[PDB]
Amino acid sequence: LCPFGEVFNATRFASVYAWNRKRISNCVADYSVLYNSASFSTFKCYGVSPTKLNDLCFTNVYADSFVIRGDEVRQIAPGQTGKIADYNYKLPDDFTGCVIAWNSNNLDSKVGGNYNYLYRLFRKSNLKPFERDISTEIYQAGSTPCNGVEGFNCYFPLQSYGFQPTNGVGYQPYRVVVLSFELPATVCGP
Amino acid sequence: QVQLVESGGGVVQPGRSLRLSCAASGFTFSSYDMHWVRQAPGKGLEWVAVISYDGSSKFYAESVKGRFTISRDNSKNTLYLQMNSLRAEETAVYYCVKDGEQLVPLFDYWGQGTLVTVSSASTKGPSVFPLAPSGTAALGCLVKDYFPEPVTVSWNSGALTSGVHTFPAVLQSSGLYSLSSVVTVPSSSLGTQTYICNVNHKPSNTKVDKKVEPKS
Amino acid sequence: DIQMTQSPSSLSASVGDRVTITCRASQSISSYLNWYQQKPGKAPKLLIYAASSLQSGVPSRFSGSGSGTDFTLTISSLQPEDFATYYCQQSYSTPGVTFGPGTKVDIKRTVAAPSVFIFPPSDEQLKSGTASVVCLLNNFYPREAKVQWKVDNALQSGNSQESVTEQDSKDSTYSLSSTLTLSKADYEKHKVYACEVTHQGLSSPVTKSFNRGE
Ligand SMILES: *[C@@H]1O[C@H](CO)[C@@H](O[C@@H]2O[C@H](CO)[C@@H](O)[C@H](O)[C@H]2NC(C)=O)[C@H](O)[C@H]1NC(C)=O
């Protein structure tokens, strides 16, 4: 088999700015284990209909995973813009693959508030498709240089998510996994 | 000779449920994803749900997710779509559709559809009022305030047919339907000739007749 | 979310015409684009799939082209049973599938001004407690015409509703009925009712009017 279990049921996830990638090759991709879970709040596929997945042959499988807040999940698709789609994780315009996400205030929300999960708020330019950027350059939001010192018009680029268990339907933590495909083949389901 | 036949339509009250059904023949129903696409009365097309060739996966348009459940039975070669907690704005024709052998959905064979009318409006027969005239003239009847649809309107029990325009119905604020049918006639005839429109509404067992005569 | 827009939403053509309908996608959908034909009261029937390749049983005078965000459907030589409404449909995002709004193609013919008639409410209707004023535009071409209700030289908006017929089989014209739906009590408060019609085949507008009473 292909190790979807290690991807989805994984106990910890990355902050969206440092999204994690796993290559998948030389195994059998069993989507029936995903279909059955009606716990997934998102499940869209691009280039292919999600019903035809156990019936297909995939070339360059990757499985990207990270955590964002709910009303940001819509930025996980081709052709979006917003803080996430521009400064954190940017899908290409011809993306072929599946985007799956599910509410997880049960595991990533802590009494009082969980600040481990971060996102980049500023960046001098937009991410390229599938670019990962973990730098902590102070952001020069002003006209005078910063010299690596925080202050007015000099901002730390990464910010924290405030995940209180008491958060709104849209301010809760979501776990996202992005299956990137291509259509020799090393991954095929039943 | 591919064929699909929807069933189970009708009028349903907002909140309550209704279950639709499609009986399919003329191809191997075994291996072809099936969809439901709907068409709002005077509007365009909206995909609703898909179920895979065996039933393992079901997916919904995000506007009906969690209310509609789709399903199938490969021994009965029939397809189902249970609609729960229906809203008034969801009145439309529902088509079942056979997918077409592509990686992504495409809508290969459609079939003719079942109408679903969602409204709390009680059954009512139409009131009919004349529109009277005074070269070539025009006159008509206004068929107003009725539910459900249809009504049918003829003129002179069918003697007059050329020059009639019975218009599409309009769903008015009331929740009731309203309509008018007009006729254009030589003017010279308005004096001697008699013009009488008949209206007929089978779902209320009303056959009403009105005579349209010039005023003053 | 991916939105499809088509142009033009109306099209008049004669038999023997090169016809071109364009679809446009809010973003690159590659070439997962399908075209449908629908005639009034019938179901939609598939013409073109995957942007460019043709359905079986479909005549070869249909063709679709383009990819990315701009696509075309072409009837290289129009034929008489092609008068219908045409839709496109992106199937890239598949748990989010979307259609065009549709382009209707009708029969082009010699222009014909409408015959305007106005109907004050009936004697019998006012007895019940509501009054309805009907403005009838009769046997015109093209489909595209403007109807303004003026009551005491004051434009009305938002209590008029209208219906229009399909293009007629024999003469290829339209007819329209604007219905101003009111109340008997409110009908009293005004004395001059009118319905002004603008159309292409009218050199200047035509108003038809009545006085409540007289
Ligand atoms: C995540 O873990 C759960 C629990 O082990 C897995 O769910 C089981 O799946 C099998 C087959 O689908 C069922 O027969 C069990 O009853 C399920 N148990 C529970 C508690 O749900 C699930 O498959 C795992 N998901 C992934 C992606 O690996």
Numbering used by the authors:
A (entry chain B): 335 to 517, 521 to 527
B (entry chain E): 1 to 134, 141 to 222
C (entry chain D): 1 to 214
Which passages does the manuscript contain on this structure?
All three antibodies recognized a region on the inner side of RBD that is hidden in the RBD-down conformation. Thus, they can only recognize RBD in the up conformation.
To resolve the interfaces, we determined crystal structures of the 10-40 and 10-28 Fab:RBD complexes. Interactions were mediated by 10-28 CDR loops H1, H3, L1, and L3, which predominantly contacted α3, but also α2 and the β2-α3, α4-α5 and α5-β4 loops of the RBD. Three mAbs, 10-40, 10-28, and 11-11, were found to bind to SARS-CoV-2 S proteins of variants D614G and B.1.351 as well as the SARS-CoV S protein. Intriguingly, we found that DH1047, REGN10985, and ADG-2 lost over 100-fold potency, whereas others, including 10-28 and S309, only lost a fewfold.
